[PDB]
Scaffold this active site. Structure first.
Site, short mmCIF file in Angstrom:
data_model
loop_
_atom_site.label_atom_id
_atom_site.label_comp_id
_atom_site.label_asym_id
_atom_site.label_seq_id
_atom_site.Cartn_x
_atom_site.Cartn_y
_atom_site.Cartn_z
N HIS B 15 0.85 -1.17 0.00
CA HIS B 15 0.00 0.00 0.00
C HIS B 15 0.90 1.23 0.00
CE1 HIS B 15 -2.35 3.24 1.58
NE2 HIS B 15 -3.44 2.56 1.25
N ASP B 17 1.00 4.29 1.20
CA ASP B 17 1.34 4.92 2.47
C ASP B 17 2.26 4.04 3.28
OD1 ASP B 17 -0.26 7.27 2.11
OD2 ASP B 17 -2.02 6.27 3.00
N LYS B 18 2.00 2.73 3.29
CA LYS B 18 2.84 1.82 4.04
C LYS B 18 4.22 1.68 3.40
CE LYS B 18 1.36 0.66 8.01
NZ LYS B 18 2.54 1.47 8.50
N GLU B 43 10.50 11.94 6.36
CA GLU B 43 9.22 11.72 5.70
C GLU B 43 9.49 11.21 4.29
OE1 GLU B 43 7.03 12.00 7.77
OE2 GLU B 43 7.22 13.80 9.00
N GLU B 56 14.53 16.06 8.16
CA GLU B 56 15.66 16.57 8.91
C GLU B 56 16.39 15.43 9.59
OE1 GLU B 56 12.40 17.62 10.08
OE2 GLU B 56 12.27 18.86 8.28
N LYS B 167 -5.63 -3.96 0.77
CA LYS B 167 -6.35 -3.43 1.91
C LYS B 167 -7.36 -4.47 2.35
CE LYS B 167 -7.31 0.97 2.11
NZ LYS B 167 -7.89 2.31 1.82
N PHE B 236 -8.53 -3.94 -10.18
CA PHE B 236 -7.44 -3.31 -9.40
C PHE B 236 -6.12 -3.77 -10.02
CE2 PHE B 236 -6.21 -2.89 -4.56
CZ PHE B 236 -5.23 -1.98 -4.84
N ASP B 244 -2.27 5.70 -6.35
CA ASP B 244 -2.63 6.54 -5.21
C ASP B 244 -1.33 7.01 -4.56
OD1 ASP B 244 -4.38 7.54 -3.12
OD2 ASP B 244 -3.88 5.77 -1.92
N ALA B 245 -1.16 8.31 -4.39
CA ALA B 245 0.04 8.81 -3.74
C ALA B 245 0.13 8.29 -2.31
CB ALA B 245 0.04 10.34 -3.73
N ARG B 250 0.35 8.27 7.34
CA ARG B 250 -1.01 8.37 6.86
C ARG B 250 -1.79 7.08 7.14
NH1 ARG B 250 -2.43 12.58 3.23
NH2 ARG B 250 -4.14 11.17 2.78
N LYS B 251 -1.23 6.19 7.96
CA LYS B 251 -1.87 4.95 8.39
C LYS B 251 -1.76 4.81 9.90
CE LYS B 251 -3.83 3.50 4.74
NZ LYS B 251 -4.03 4.95 4.57
N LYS B 271 11.24 8.37 12.77
CA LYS B 271 11.53 9.21 13.92
C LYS B 271 12.35 8.44 14.96
CE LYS B 271 7.13 11.72 13.59
NZ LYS B 271 5.91 12.08 14.34
N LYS B 275 11.59 11.80 19.57
CA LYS B 275 10.26 12.17 19.11
C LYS B 275 9.25 11.33 19.88
CE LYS B 275 12.91 13.87 15.67
NZ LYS B 275 14.37 14.04 15.83
N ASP B 277 6.15 11.26 19.93
CA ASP B 277 5.06 10.68 19.17
C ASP B 277 5.19 9.17 19.08
OD1 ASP B 277 3.57 12.95 18.47
OD2 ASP B 277 4.63 13.22 16.57
C1 LIG Z 1 -9.01 3.92 -3.66
S1 LIG Z 1 -7.34 4.61 -3.57
C2 LIG Z 1 -6.80 4.26 -1.88
C3 LIG Z 1 -6.23 2.84 -1.78
O1 LIG Z 1 -7.13 1.95 -2.23
C4 LIG Z 1 -6.35 0.89 -3.05
N1 LIG Z 1 -6.80 0.92 -4.40
C5 LIG Z 1 -6.21 1.53 -5.45
N2 LIG Z 1 -6.83 1.27 -6.58
C6 LIG Z 1 -7.86 0.44 -6.25
C7 LIG Z 1 -8.80 -0.19 -7.01
N3 LIG Z 1 -8.95 -0.08 -8.39
N4 LIG Z 1 -9.71 -0.97 -6.41
C8 LIG Z 1 -9.65 -1.14 -5.05
N5 LIG Z 1 -8.75 -0.56 -4.27
C9 LIG Z 1 -7.84 0.23 -4.91
C10 LIG Z 1 -5.02 1.16 -2.85
O2 LIG Z 1 -4.52 0.45 -1.64
C11 LIG Z 1 -4.87 2.67 -2.58
O3 LIG Z 1 -3.77 3.05 -1.88
K LIG Z 2 7.78 16.40 9.88
K LIG Z 3 -3.40 9.52 -1.41
MG LIG Z 4 3.74 15.03 15.70
MG LIG Z 5 -7.90 6.97 3.61
MG LIG Z 6 4.10 16.89 11.29
MG LIG Z 7 -3.43 7.32 1.89
#
Ligand SMILES: CSC[C@H]1O[C@@H](n2cnc3c(N)ncnc32)[C@H](O)[C@@H]1O
Ligand SMILES: [K+]
Ligand SMILES: [K+]
Ligand SMILES: [Mg+2]
Ligand SMILES: [Mg+2]
Ligand SMILES: [Mg+2]
Ligand SMILES: [Mg+2]
Ligand SMILES: CSC[C@H]1O[C@@H](n2cnc3c(N)ncnc32)[C@H](O)[C@@H]1O
EC number: 2.5.1.6
Lengths: 381, 381
Positions: B15, B17-18, B43, B56, B167, B236, B244-245, B250-251, B271, B275, B277
């Protein structure tokens, strides 16, 4: 003795993560102004001298990203290299592509709007508490107001040494009251704010107590035992993205309930209504606030969840902390009879194609300005 | 009838983000291998063809970022343009600077290690529940195990159409039990996983039920009413950063408790121990698990908070959901007598200079592998 402490934080408009949220939502709004059905998933990253946009947008709009980004940074107040960042001269880099066609076909292509699928799977929570009129935790309300006061005194020139990057943190002592919570006093306040090279530490600490804290926090909550950590690092000249990289969606607890209730993990900024991370969290807030303002609960947590491509939520749950005479099952039935949590219905109820999102991206998304999710629904039961 | 639903999600190693969390922690580990006192705030951002490092780092280590990043992506499994991403040929961009000297002077310069200040303000929570042996919510445990099973069947070649991005989401029906929670059955499962262009949808759905779900979820929890959303988007093929960026941090709910308990907002990956966190959330987990495994509670939430530059926490709070004969005040006293939550002591207790962080960055930071924060402290009271 039945009391406990709880702490929440907030950050200012120039905190680098919040810069990114505001830019992401400025981009979203710019698209929605021209194409109400734009599909937007705009992430922003900020570091010294750089704003990078990365993500996926499919839209009929023609958006000048250089202008939109630089205007957002200008509004925040980063307008000179002496402040660490300047909208006029920073780098703006763009790595934006269309929305994946595989997502589009599974979510919204050739679907009736009311029957659009959720744009992703996920879980979301809404929360409300009767401890303030705006149905938010006092800890987070006060923390936000302290950052807003800093920005006000920066912009009106009365504390001209202030810069845009700030953080605040408020610890309140509470009493428990049949599952509700009652604020007693402020136990500790932290304020850290970026500043110019000329002002000294004692001047800043005195001003933060007298012109910021006392202007915001009712005296009845402050006493001889309250602890103040004002400019606790001792020096904060370097700030903004130069001091710390920023990313969209890295202030999700500041954006919501300050540690109270719960969070499903999904960021709000830069996303159109089909991304249920935002729209269903707004709807869940609307449900929670409707239950509290309707007199059914004093405090409530609402969970919802979705699967990508599926319109109706997979689960809905109500947790009332013992603050209702009705059972949680009864409240869930009331919610199900009064709300339709499909994203293609939420969009209509909460007017989520309207380009108001940049206004949500600082000082919390909830508890302010009578946005549609803050106007309670009259419940039938 | 006293039952409720609760939903949690997890994501796979690919994924986007991961991916970023794992790269950020690979960078952290690479520094710590050479300089145990490295100050790291790395980051990562991922989009089509790109890994960007921004943040940093002040360290005596000599780290080859191109090698570290590409090896992490290789391990995840993105090794060919047909999969959407290739460690051999992607762009790796680096925007890393030293730690701000203003932060350094306020946090750690010329401080005794035990008396180092917190690296930032913030709030953190730990949680534990006796519903599983590992003291984690069943919803999140099952969701993680489903992603791990996908990766196992991808890597062993038995489902060769699988790709790394996945996911999962699990909804469990629970009963309430004097503040504790008792899982009854699995109500709904979602699985979405990136796949090759050749496999058909029915083959994937059959395999996901028979070879993934049935291999992971005890049959006693699955019945004729369980709802399955398997490849619910229908297609998919595009996935990973191309779909997806991704961004570090973000997780944060996948990384922790799946919506149960609470979160203070701060990300873990990339970190070092200063830190809070990360380090104070690990310590708060350690406290919570120690209370449950020690028989003092069945379920507990712990809050701590800090101010930048200050060693001792500003607040500590214990919420036991009614699952102890002792009051929350009594449990707080036990915690205060048994734990020292200064970051410069946590580092010693939890061995937080050791370069094991990449191992934490997928499948949750808690409930696995007997990391130091998962080994309960024997409490004296
Ligand atoms: C929907 S975009 C957010 C996350 O959903 C997953 N995703 C991306 N494309 C698809 C897709 N076509 N169908 C289902 N999940 C998706 C990926 O893990 C992505 O990071
Ligand atoms: K930061
Ligand atoms: K994203
Ligand atoms: Mg923080
Ligand atoms: Mg989300
Ligand atoms: Mg921050
Ligand atoms: Mg995300
Ligand atoms: C400690 S870095 C995380 C956040 O803390 C703030 N910060 C940055 N530098 C300092 C500093 N010298 N003192 C206090 N807070 C700071 C900024 O809001 C940053 O985004």
């Amino acid at each position: 003795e039945g009391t406990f402490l709880f702490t929440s934080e907030s950050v200012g408009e120039g905190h680098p993560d919040k810069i990114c949220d505001q830019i992401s939502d400025a981009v979203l709004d710019a698209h929605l102004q021209q194409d109400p059905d734009a599909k937007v998933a705009c992430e922003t990253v900020a570091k010294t001298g750089m704003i990078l946009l990365a993500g996926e947008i499919t839209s009929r709009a023609a958006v000048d990203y250089q202008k939109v980004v630089r205007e957002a940074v200008k509004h925040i107040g980063y307008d000179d290299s002496s402040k660490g960042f300047d909208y006029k001269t920073c780098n703006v880099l763009v790595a934006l592509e269309q929305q994946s066609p595989d997502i589009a076909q599974g979510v919204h292509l050739d679907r009736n709007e009311e029957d659009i699928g959720a744009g992703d799977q996920g879980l979301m929570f809404g929360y409300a508490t009767d401890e303030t009129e705006e149905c938010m935790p006092l800890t987070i309300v006060l923390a936000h107001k302290l950052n807003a006061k800093l920005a006000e005194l920066r912009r009106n020139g009365t504390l001209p040494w202030l810069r845009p990057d700030s953080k605040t943190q408020v610890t309140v002592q509470y009493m428990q009251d049949r599952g509700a919570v009652l604020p007693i006093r402020v136990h500790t306040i932290v304020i850290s704010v970026q500043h110019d090279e000329e002002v000294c530490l004692d001047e800043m600490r005195d001003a933060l107590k007298e012109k910021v804290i006392k202007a915001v926090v009712p005296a009845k909550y402050l006493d001889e035992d309250t602890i103040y950590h004002l400019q606790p690092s001792g020096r904060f000249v370097i700030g903004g993205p130069q001091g710390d990289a920023g990313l969209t969606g890295r202030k999700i607890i500041v954006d919501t309930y300050g540690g109270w209730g719960a969070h499903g993990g999904g960021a709000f900024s830069g996303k159109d209504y089909t991304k249920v991370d935002r729209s269903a969290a707004y709807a869940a807030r609307w449900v929670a606030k409707s239950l509290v303002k309707g007199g059914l609960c004093r405090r409530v947590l609402v969970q919802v969840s979705y699967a990508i491509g599926v319109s109706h939520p997979l689960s809905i749950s109500i947790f009332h902390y013992g603050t209702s005479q009705k059972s949680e099952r009864e409240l869930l039935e009331i919610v199900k009879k009064n709300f339709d949590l499909r994203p293609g219905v939420i969009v209509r109820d909460l007017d989520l194609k309207k380009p108001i999102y940049q206004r949500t991206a600082a000082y919390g998304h909830f508890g302010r300005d009578s946005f549609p999710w803050e106007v309670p629904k009259k419940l039938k039961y």
